């Protein structure tokens, strides 16, 4: 799997950057920020440019990742305790300014309006009252893997994950489709609109309010997909190195359907089998294409004592416009 | 409409930065250009660069016009008789390189396999094989990849022929006819019509679809009216068809993109047209450069034959 290892110059250049954006702009509050993003990102060093641009369009690996920034511990500060109630933005803005660029260079930066207080930069950190369970707040539980919101027409195009401090090197898991592992038989199957994928709970139109006929049409065809249940392929584009949208929780396989029970039988085993252990270290950038790859976060135990490990996430859109009925206004990024 | 007139400083920027990319460049065809494309449109006027953000994220107006290029009449030379056979790159190469530069801005260029051998660039200019009756539509109306956005940059137009717009004018619709039209009820049929892989016709025709779809209160469209049936039964979505025609047909503009200028429609909120005018057929005509948008490449993969190709079918 390629990647891009940054010089000392490159991160010093790259550093210099967003320090400097982040004292231009006040906050993503500021509209003429999101404007400017992808000319800013031009500013980076070429040869990151050039990599990510590569990826991009070679549409062939489903994770690359950039290593050896300078990520300044002692101007980034403690990992909080919280996301709620934190002063925006905080002394981290750099960073979060930096995976915006990044984010610019492959499409566009998007968000969800319930999550985070609609931030376009979630953080990743342990919580301690979110000890219990599987999420990206958590740590002691296991997060299995799986394509971000399979189910949904809208979903992240690619996902961007800045390791800020990872002081034990707790990995995070990927895995890619090995095609020839698969008979051609399961391929065709799998093609097919034989399986029911099933939203995330956050998801249900039913979790928000009932008023007004504004937002019950921005859930609408969301609300559809519920009721009328619709069968869909969990691979597709290129037959010969197709995308695929695998959620093994939320995946149902109709009990009748005997091909498309072995079909996925194969693949989640071939799947569950190439999943890899992928660490970002402090000062590591991954970029995983979510119709190439699944993802997942392995358990580990925190400290709770600001010396935790500390991701940075932005989810990147292809096209914008296309999820334009789920958007409150046109001008906003946030889904919902 | 906003619009924006590029000053001489400007202009001549545009012009050098053309002239270098077209010598260090051998055609479209070298994939590194195609690679540097958004790169190298960053090296494009900032006020340039951000009035076309502005205008893609604002996601309000149907086109907009960049006007006050300074196209070398000299270098570009005479309007050619026909796109066939005519080698690729021309004199007026570096005119298509600012289109590809400004389609980068926007998003990627694309093309069709079948339409004027494949070529990025489509000219527009009057050929010799030719009651001419007005249409418009939006582009490719029935693909389920067509066009995001069109960028039409007026190489040459010594009678100022226009180019007809229409965008959709909401308030002269009931919220019931817009709900009809938001269904899957309408058939649009596909305009006029190598031997592998898998030969030619793949993903081919099947559901009915919806005309307006994005938001109900400032809704995309897609209609193209000649290619537009609806089965004879439904009669509500017969009614709120001609009351949707009725609408943009009387809304339409016309647009001139003289020389120097460069048209980009978007292709949700615009239809657009061309006019019938009479070409002298000497090498002076009217001479247009279209690129077409994909917000999103990757979409169209299935009817691309490989990952780098640009060109569906
Ligand atoms: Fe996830
Ligand atoms: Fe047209």
Request: proline share 7%.
């Amino acid at each position: 799997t390629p990647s891009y290892s940054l010089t000392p110059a490159e991160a010093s250049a790259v550093a210099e950057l967003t320090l400097e954006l982040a004292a231009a702009y006040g906050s993503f509050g500021d509209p003429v920020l999101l404007r400017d993003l992808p000319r800013l990102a031009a500013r980076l060093p070429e040869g990151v440019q050039d990599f990510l641009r590569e990826f991009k369009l070679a549409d062939r690996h489903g994770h690359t990742v950039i290593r050896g920034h300078d990520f300044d511990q002692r101007r980034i500060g403690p990992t909080p305790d919280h996301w709620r109630g934190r002063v925006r933005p905080g002394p981290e803005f750099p960073e979060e300014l930096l995976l915006m660029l990044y984010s610019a260079l492959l499409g566009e930066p998007f968000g969800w309006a319930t999550q985070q207080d609609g931030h376009l930069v979630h953080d990743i950190f342990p919580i301690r009252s979110h000890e219990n369970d599987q999420l990206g707040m958590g740590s002691k539980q296991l997060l299995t893997w799986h394509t971000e919101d399979a189910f949904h027409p809208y979903r992240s195009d690619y996902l961007i994950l800045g390791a800020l401090r990872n002081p034990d090197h707790v990995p995070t898991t990927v895995g890619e489709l090995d095609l020839s592992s698969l008979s051609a038989e399961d391929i065709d199957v799998l093609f097919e609109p034989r399986y029911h994928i099933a939203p995330d709970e956050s998801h249900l139109p039913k979790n928000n309010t009932i008023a007004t006929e504004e937002e019950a049409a921005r859930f609408a065809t969301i609300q559809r997909m519920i009721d009328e249940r619709p069968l869909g392929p969990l691979l597709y584009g290129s037959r010969l190195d197709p995308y695929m949208r695998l959620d093994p929780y939320f995946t149902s396989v109709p009990q009748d359907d005997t091909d498309a029970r072995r079909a996925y039988d194969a693949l989640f085993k071939v799947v569950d089998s190439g999943m890899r252990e992928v660490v970002a270290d402090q000062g590591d950038v991954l970029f995983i294409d979510n119709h190439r790859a699944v993802h997942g976060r392995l358990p580990f135990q925190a400290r709770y004592d600001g010396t935790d490990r500390w991701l940075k996430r932005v989810c990147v859109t292809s096209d914008l416009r296309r999820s334009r009925e789920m958007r409150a206004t046109s001008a906003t990024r946030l889904l919902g």
